[PDB]
Design a protein around this motif. Sequence first.
Motif, PDB file in Angstrom:
ATOM      1  N   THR A  27       3.142  69.684  -9.336  1.00 27.49           N
ATOM      2  CA  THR A  27       3.862  68.975 -10.225  1.00 27.49           C
ATOM      3  C   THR A  27       2.835  67.960 -10.939  1.00 27.49           C
ATOM      4  N   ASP A  67      13.847  77.536 -18.942  1.00 28.50           N
ATOM      5  CA  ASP A  67      14.026  76.698 -17.721  1.00 28.50           C
ATOM      6  C   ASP A  67      12.830  76.084 -17.390  1.00 28.50           C
ATOM      7  N   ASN A  87      11.721  72.038 -17.477  1.00 32.89           N
ATOM      8  CA  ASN A  87      11.003  71.605 -16.179  1.00 32.89           C
ATOM      9  C   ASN A  87      10.025  70.762 -16.626  1.00 32.89           C
ATOM     10  N   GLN A 121       9.279  66.451 -16.665  1.00 36.43           N
ATOM     11  CA  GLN A 121       8.311  65.514 -15.866  1.00 36.43           C
ATOM     12  C   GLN A 121       7.579  64.703 -16.824  1.00 36.43           C
TER      13      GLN A 121
END
Length: 580
Positions: A247, A309, A313, A317
């Motif tokens: 991430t 998608d 995502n 973030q």
Amino acid sequence: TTLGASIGSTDFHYLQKDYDEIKKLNLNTWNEVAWIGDELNSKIVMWTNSSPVNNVTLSSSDFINENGDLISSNNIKISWLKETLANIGRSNPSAPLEPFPDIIHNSGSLNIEKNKIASAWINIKIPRNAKPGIYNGSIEVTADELEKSYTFDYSFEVLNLVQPLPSETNTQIEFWQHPYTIARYYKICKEDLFTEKHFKYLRGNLKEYRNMGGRGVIATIVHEAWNHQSYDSDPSMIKWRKNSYGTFEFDYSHFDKWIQLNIDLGILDPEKGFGQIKCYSIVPWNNRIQYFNEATNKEEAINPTPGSDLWINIWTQFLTSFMSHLEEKGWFNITYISMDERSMDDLKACVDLIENITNNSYEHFKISSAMDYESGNDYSFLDRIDDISIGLSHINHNSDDMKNMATHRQELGLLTTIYTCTGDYPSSFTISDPSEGAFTIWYSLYQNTNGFLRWSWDGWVENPLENVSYKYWEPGDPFLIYPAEKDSIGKTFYSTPRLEKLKEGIRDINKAKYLMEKAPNLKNSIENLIYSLKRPNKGENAYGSAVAASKEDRDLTISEANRIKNGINNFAREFISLTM
Ligand SMILES: [Br-]
Ligand SMILES: [Br-]
Ligand SMILES: [Br-]
Ligand SMILES: [Br-]
Ligand SMILES: [Br-]
Ligand SMILES: [Br-]
Ligand SMILES: [Br-]
Ligand SMILES: [Br-]
Ligand SMILES: [Br-]
Ligand SMILES: [Br-]
Ligand SMILES: [Br-]
Ligand SMILES: [Br-]
Ligand SMILES: [Br-]
Ligand SMILES: [Br-]
Ligand SMILES: [Br-]
Ligand SMILES: [Br-]
Ligand SMILES: [Br-]
Ligand SMILES: [Br-]
Ligand SMILES: [Br-]
Ligand SMILES: [Br-]
Ligand SMILES: [Br-]
Ligand SMILES: [Br-]
Ligand SMILES: [Br-]
Ligand SMILES: [Br-]
Ligand SMILES: [Br-]
Ligand SMILES: [Br-]
Ligand SMILES: [Br-]
Ligand SMILES: [Br-]
Ligand SMILES: [Br-]
Ligand SMILES: [Br-]
Ligand SMILES: [Br-]
Ligand SMILES: [Br-]
Ligand SMILES: [Br-]
Ligand SMILES: [Br-]
Ligand SMILES: [Br-]
Ligand SMILES: [Br-]
Ligand SMILES: [Br-]
Ligand SMILES: [Br-]
Ligand SMILES: [Br-]
Ligand SMILES: [Br-]
Ligand SMILES: [Br-]
Ligand SMILES: [Br-]
Ligand SMILES: [Br-]
Ligand SMILES: [Br-]
Ligand SMILES: [Br-]
Ligand SMILES: [Br-]
Ligand SMILES: [Br-]
Ligand SMILES: [Br-]
Ligand SMILES: [Br-]
Ligand SMILES: [Br-]
Ligand SMILES: [Br-]
Ligand SMILES: [Br-]
Ligand SMILES: [Br-]
Ligand SMILES: [Br-]
Ligand SMILES: [Br-]
Ligand SMILES: [Br-]
Ligand SMILES: [Br-]
Ligand SMILES: [Br-]
Ligand SMILES: [Br-]
Ligand SMILES: [Br-]
Ligand SMILES: [Br-]
Ligand SMILES: [Br-]
Ligand SMILES: [Br-]
Ligand SMILES: [Br-]
Ligand SMILES: [Br-]
Ligand SMILES: [Br-]
Ligand SMILES: [Br-]
Ligand SMILES: [Br-]
Ligand SMILES: [Br-]
Ligand SMILES: [Br-]
Ligand SMILES: [Br-]
Ligand SMILES: [Br-]
């Protein structure tokens, strides 16, 4: 004649190629009209014959009105125009290089070579507590090789109304700044980025921006967002890293120092809701996001498709983190996520995602974008974007569709501007008539928009003081100001006639807006004067640059700005007489 001299217009350049015609001038008087707290600009054009002339100097007297009220020579600044070389084409390496007097340079004395034109820019600042009246003064030109000095008779009228301070107005101006270019030019190393050493080279030009009405401040949020279109790279002010959890983490260090600078200078005021942080961009070039991958210890990039998608995502973030960061600083409420001219499918994916991400008070990011609006009254999508800018080339002069679209936005409290860029005419290039900037700003009011945007505060090439030529675009397109000399001790920038004509336009539309607000019996008549504005047609020179379509179109740009400004000053006199 060793040195000849005449008053000259600020609307167009006096060029070396026109030497023989320029030498016929003999204008010795000037007069213009200003408000209290306004500015006026003039020019004296000079020429040499077969001898050089040394130590040419210009001096102003004090200006005095019919009651003996004084506007000090302290308020008059006379600066020589400096020429720089420009390739006159667009993406045309074989086009000719010619000199243009695009730089408002320094005061003091100049030595002039034989058989040359040289001009001096004159700026008159009317103090904010000046008394009204007709003021008289003079400017004297002396030189070593000139037995009889020239005296030019100057006058101006100050009308009994006060030029609004930029903060008092509803005019929107946004010029994109490139503080890493400033660092490159002045040899600021990486470790000194956004330190005081860098700030000393930013503050002067940023105050210049503030003082003419600049409100928008751009900040890059991804790496190389415009695919290195400019001479200098565009670093990200926010560094992206991917960690071992897979991430993303964000370093706001540069972003924060840049924004705080603009807050300290008074361009932005988040507590007051003043100014905009424009964050470029959720649709950077080819959707490309470059980041440092901690797990492999290398830079990587992705280019996810908007609305996928993976794209949702990654941008969720970034947006949720950035939002929390901004809320910690107290900056969220003036922050806009910028889009760009992209497919409607991509733009809809961006708006959908940004509307979905809200803070604990049910607010989402504001959104800003250039848009290609040309016609029609479906405003459903545009109403979801808080600030849009429409390029001049998309605006149909024969139609009221643009003005109706902007009026709808004015009613909803949204922001609208126009912009110019490569290929537009009128525009703000080195080769443009400076007058074109004043016309541009009047055009923004003709369209019932809030003002003007341009991408090009300070996008310098290597050594623009000597040659402005770049591989793309008409010359000077990327910058409205020049740097100072690399070793300057003192000045950190120079203005340009084209910038000064934008400033004149902005002051003058602000006069119009002041009267439309303060003078109800005049508003409709003022609107109808503005709505009479004509638009010149465009064409191209032999080397790909946008220029006027004809001599008639060229002169129209000047005579229209003149005409509207004079009509507004007549309405001003009417309002003054009514008020008594
Ligand atoms: Br002569
Ligand atoms: Br003139
Ligand atoms: Br003139
Ligand atoms: Br010519
Ligand atoms: Br001329
Ligand atoms: Br005269
Ligand atoms: Br005037
Ligand atoms: Br001669
Ligand atoms: Br002076
Ligand atoms: Br001076
Ligand atoms: Br000046
Ligand atoms: Br030159
Ligand atoms: Br040209
Ligand atoms: Br070539
Ligand atoms: Br060619
Ligand atoms: Br030439
Ligand atoms: Br100086
Ligand atoms: Br010489
Ligand atoms: Br202003
Ligand atoms: Br320092
Ligand atoms: Br400073
Ligand atoms: Br300063
Ligand atoms: Br101004
Ligand atoms: Br791009
Ligand atoms: Br590109
Ligand atoms: Br960097
Ligand atoms: Br980065
Ligand atoms: Br983080
Ligand atoms: Br940080
Ligand atoms: Br830092
Ligand atoms: Br900071
Ligand atoms: Br500061
Ligand atoms: Br400061
Ligand atoms: Br604002
Ligand atoms: Br693209
Ligand atoms: Br790519
Ligand atoms: Br990176
Ligand atoms: Br690497
Ligand atoms: Br990669
Ligand atoms: Br990479
Ligand atoms: Br890629
Ligand atoms: Br990824
Ligand atoms: Br991808
Ligand atoms: Br998908
Ligand atoms: Br995913
Ligand atoms: Br998240
Ligand atoms: Br939050
Ligand atoms: Br939170
Ligand atoms: Br906030
Ligand atoms: Br979504
Ligand atoms: Br549209
Ligand atoms: Br319809
Ligand atoms: Br929609
Ligand atoms: Br639309
Ligand atoms: Br067009
Ligand atoms: Br155009
Ligand atoms: Br407005
Ligand atoms: Br180049
Ligand atoms: Br180009
Ligand atoms: Br140096
Ligand atoms: Br300065
Ligand atoms: Br006002
Ligand atoms: Br009235
Ligand atoms: Br009336
Ligand atoms: Br009338
Ligand atoms: Br027309
Ligand atoms: Br040509
Ligand atoms: Br022409
Ligand atoms: Br012409
Ligand atoms: Br005229
Ligand atoms: Br006037
Ligand atoms: Br009135």
